[PDB]
């Protein structure tokens, strides 16, 4: 039976351990996890939230960027819906707030409360600038939640506002962080509007944003100090329109995402996106792939990053429906060998269950990991909490399954051989502490490889293969 | 321990994945699944229903041919019974209906209803031609279910019939599909009898059959426009008599089927079948085999197709009773290497659980797959629905087990070391949608291999081996 | 502890058995199950499908009426939606079809096919009458599915139609069933339009409807030969508008349905419905109640029928959330004692698990039973089939639970302490055979009471109480 002997063996994460190496690491603090998402996008931590409609919408994208990673907004929504989520992410924080929310002086406190609970930002906004009219936005004063706390619904805005002559106001549209910090410290105020030469409202700077920018600059930020966020598109004719509008909404990267990324459909979508100035202003990531030849083709088509993984996802059953796939450790090894020589970062997407798997993925050459299941069921993941026979749970479902595709039909106003499933995950709490523990686990693995950086982790890691017997010894055994 | 190291390793479907390849496939519609069952028999889809007495009798054979595959009628029945199932399959549809059912004009509506519910076709027939007597069949008119809907049981046929002078009748025994379509369109009628020069009834053409022939020519048809169907025989002296009578009944292929096909018993049965003009008019398929040497021997004996599989069947325990077998992927690889050079198609028989396994079998060189378990418990599978501790189930049982062999004794009017078992499967509904989903899964696997045809799938597919750890990552993991 | 001793004991179905009595019943056919739903509505069988959004929409209501029972359309939909379901039920069959579907002669076969698949009747319609224009409906001919079977999408209706001068047409707007049967038998036709003095189309009579009316008159029919159907309303101001529109749509009874029917809200809704001529034309049923005092109050308010049951429903948890309820056998006994003296039929609603429970409910005085769980998951029940960890299932959910109430918000375009739950039931197949088996079980229980009628069952039944030990002996014990 000679044909069988020539078939190569592919490995997944559970097939290997990282071999301990000489470590000069003395402090857990010396281990730097900064990495590249794509050719022109750096991240403080190598964690990407999956573009799944049970993992990443605006609340997850905001949380991931705040931890120093990023979320990819899923495309199983209308273009209008996807862009709206993106604008909400961009609205979470800023340095100079463009188009700050305003109100007119003859309006009521009831209308002030409605403006403060603006649906354009999760949590609303903390102040409204009082202006004479919508067209001129001549600044008359400012009103905050605090100023409304004892008001009757009928009380006028101007009766409760701080007038502009009592405000600290600037005309410096280039004001620095140090300068506005000085104005707030000296003026003992929490809001500095920026106005034009005719007193018209141009920007707002808030103490909340200044405090964040002065603190740990872990957060993933664009050039305006807003949170970084990506968005997924498909490969159909209409996806080009989606891509253009996502970039207009502020997308920092686009992710071309189809099950079989080694296809002309994906290669031609990448070429189209790099060929149009309306979309070529942002890095184009493409997947999903699992071979050296596929990496070469997508890189040659112009991809700024590659997403690796055919079948390993928790809710994925491509391997059961089509029979196709590559064990994920071998896929990462093969794809990153090609990509590293061309300078193209790779996302290891799918099949990760523990922080230990993240260490292995980075050790096998990945620059980032993409997580679905490990982040599903967190507070910030979309969906309702449900009681699944006793405990609190949330839905996780494949994007090639029935549930996600009927929901894509219900949201976009519209013969499926499914390649994903639906299930529940236990509610995990806020995603922040979970991400921090995963990064802490990665740092432990880097210390075992003697690595103080991601590039050192990729260069220094050596693996040893284990049998099923070795795998059992690796988890907890013999206790209850 | 050197002897052990020289034993080769055989692989089954769960040992490998199809490696994704460059795909130029743009539309799911561009993927053609047409294939060969045997040297002279083509099929639109590569699915064969197993010759098991819990899988394929007349209703399953009809359904499979209608989907573009085929069923193999099992031989655990009397010759008379096997031939009767075959004639019912052939009676399901036709272009020219030979010996159409008739009735005499002085008969009653009660007798008309009995003739319409003729046991020679599942569902009966829709019309009876009224003729003067059984010997001359001079056409007097036609009576349909519609004409009986308000009749009393005592009303005469001729009182309710449409008379012949009001019918559209032809004398063209070579009438084309376009010509009879024109006669039906112009005559605004649903039945065109074909009569001889003396008005005697020769054939009938019905609108139902014309509509089918005008629609999607997916269905597996013989030269008369009837559904294709095969039949199994053994290797005993009496099996030659069974074979002759099956061919007379309309069998389109014969399948010589014994557990150990690499035996003189099987080789000599193939030689006997090719040597007799009463059976050599149809392709002779033989199995079951699992080695290159076995393929060579059966091909040299004259086989037009090979059936591959020793032990992998869901209900099979040959490997537990005799200890013999070959892991099915390696068996397909080895057998098809020999057979492809001789032009002999191969059926991968047994051990298939998902559409993904079908993609692997075709990728390993098989031209068709044979399914037992995946089709058992469908509406069209034989047997009664049963309640197995709550839910609706149907029996599936091995043909070398006790249950099937006592039933073979009860049907043919008649020291077993069993090599099959009995069990239940959940009721699956109609087989049609299940077959369509399996073919859809296969098309997905072909797209991953970049293949637009079965021959391209066989040439282009490359496998990667996975460990048990890789297999776990391949299904659903970490969700409920 | 004397206070405790004075609390009476309530019984449920599992607490009692029907004591066998002297039976003169010789044939299973002698047992008549005809009963009253309400003062002025009779049913051939005593089975009512529950007004739950997982049990009864138009397909279930049609099936129940065809078996001789009735369905109550649920109100967790817009008024427009509830009325639309009702009109579809009324459209399922008729004697004189009002406003039969028409088409114009210059239209295409493609437009004919669209008219035949009219969404106003489940399954569409079988013919379209060809008329000169929508305003006059002068009959020009008729076109059927059969006439389109060989047409091109572009072929004109008038080219394919049967012209009116070749049709059998009547001007008798009072035509009897015997007379139209004669016209169809003599004319050898399946459609008899009824036209006016100027040839304008007034009604259509079809052979399908005639055959049904000639067969077993088991079906629950209104005076026009359409299927009987009821509809639920609440007790809010807007429910009066819903009630008026339901009656206009053809509702044969209205069911005032709230959890606590012994309340001024329910009593005043009944009084309002009986007091308005727009709703007083149909029987008003009210519930849910569980005491003699409650029956007296609703009867005094004018109820034509009572629905009995507080808490016993399969998906109901009123008893766990509020702590209130009455064991269902005792509730039926107490309520029917009052109602029988006033001539008001009672529906035993909830907690029924087997046909044996139905016999007990009727024996305890109920005129009908209402079933949710036993009919959920049938083909005709609403909702999608789902795979719940292996087998095919359908959702069943309480109308006071979260799932049904969010769906009521999604359908009507809109602080819940839930009193119902959600769950799955195994798919049961078509509801018809299930209903027939339940009625067969009831007939067996009636035979044990020596009863040949429902009234005899209510008068003759005697119960014996069993302990938990007796209950175990009653089901299957000691076998696998
Ligand atoms: N006041 C105000 N804050 C905004 C607006 N848009 C976004 N934000 C964000 O909302 C946060 C304000 O926090 P606060 O202290 O106002 O609750 C900051 O991160 C700020 O950038 C806006 O229009 N007005
Ligand atoms: N084959 C397949 N992969 C999916 C499907 N849905 C999500 N995925 C993949 O699974 C990844 C998540 O993997 P997880 O971290 O949950 O194991 C996603 O980022 C995506 O690449 C699906 O329906 N089919
Ligand atoms: N009328 C008629 N149909 C037959 C006979 N034998 C087989 N059939 C098949 O029964 C089907 C007729 O459908 P119908 O429209 O008659 O229900 C066709 O597929 C036809 O070929 C026969 O003897 N008479
Ligand atoms: N060894 C053995 N094979 C069987 C027996 N019965 C059926 N088979 C094989 O099992 C195949 C069905 O495999 P399945 O698709 O159910 O896994 C049949 O086509 C036949 O080759 C049996 O009793 N013993
Ligand atoms: N032809 C026709 N049938 C209707 C219409 N509305 C309801 N139906 C019902 O549809 C059924 C007709 O069955 P057919 O034989 O037309 O398939 C009958 O029960 C009939 O009452 C209509 O407008 N036209
Ligand atoms: N208390 C309560 N009863 C319900 C609820 N939903 C349905 N029901 C009752 O339960 C009955 C169905 O009972 P089943 O036949 O499923 O045991 C319905 O007809 C209705 O009276 C609910 O959410 N709460
Ligand atoms: K361990
Ligand atoms: K998987
Ligand atoms: K018993």
Author numbering:
A (entry chain A), B (entry chain A), C (entry chain A): 3 to 416, 424 to 489
Provide excerpts from the study.
Here, we demonstrate the determination of the crystal structures of T. brucei GMPR; a protein that, unlike the GMPRs of host animals, possesses a CBS domain. We further show that TbGMPR activity is regulated by purine nucleotide binding to an allosteric regulatory site formed at the cleft between the catalytic and CBS domains of the enzyme. Our kinetic and structural analyses clearly demonstrate that the CBS domain has a pivotal role in the allosteric regulation of the activity and structure of TbGMPR, facilitating the transitions among three conformations: a tetramer, and octamers with relaxed and twisted conformations. A combination of X-ray crystallography and size-exclusion chromatography small-angle X-ray scattering (SEC-SAXS) analysis clearly revealed that TbGMPR can exist as a tetramer or an octamer depending on the nucleotide species that is bound to the CBS domain.
We also determined the structure of TbGMPR C318A with substrate GMP (C318A/GMP) at 1.90-Å resolution and found that C318A/GMP adopted an octameric structure as observed in C318A apo. However, two tetramers in the C318A/GMP octamer were arranged in a twisted position around the fourfold axis compared to C318A apo, and the overall structure of the C318A/GMP octamer was compressed along the fourfold axis. Thus, it appears that GMP induces the transformation of TbGMPR from a “relaxed” (C318A apo) to a “twisted” form (C318A/GMP). Two GMP molecules were observed in each subunit of C318A/GMP; one was found in the active site, whereas the other was bound to the cleft between the catalytic and CBS domains. The interactions between the active site and the substrate GMP molecule involved 12 hydrogen bonds and 7 C–C contacts. The interactions between the base moiety of GMP and three amino acid residues (Met401, Ala402, and Glu428) in the catalytic domain appeared to stabilize the α-helix and a portion of the following loop structure that were disordered in C318A apo. The ligand GMP molecule at the allosteric regulatory site formed 10 hydrogen bonds to and exhibited 13 hydrophobic interactions with the amino acid residues in the CBS domain; at the same time, the O6 and N7 atoms in the GMP molecule interacted with Arg93 in the catalytic domain via hydrogen bonds. The structures of the isolated catalytic and CBS domains in C318A/GMP could be well-superposed with the respective domains in C318A apo. However, the relative orientation of these domains was obviously different between C318A/GMP and C318A apo: the CBS domain is rotated ~40° between these two structures, a change that may be induced by an interaction between the base moiety of GMP and Arg93. This hinge motion is inferred to contribute to the transformation from the relaxed to the twisted octamer.
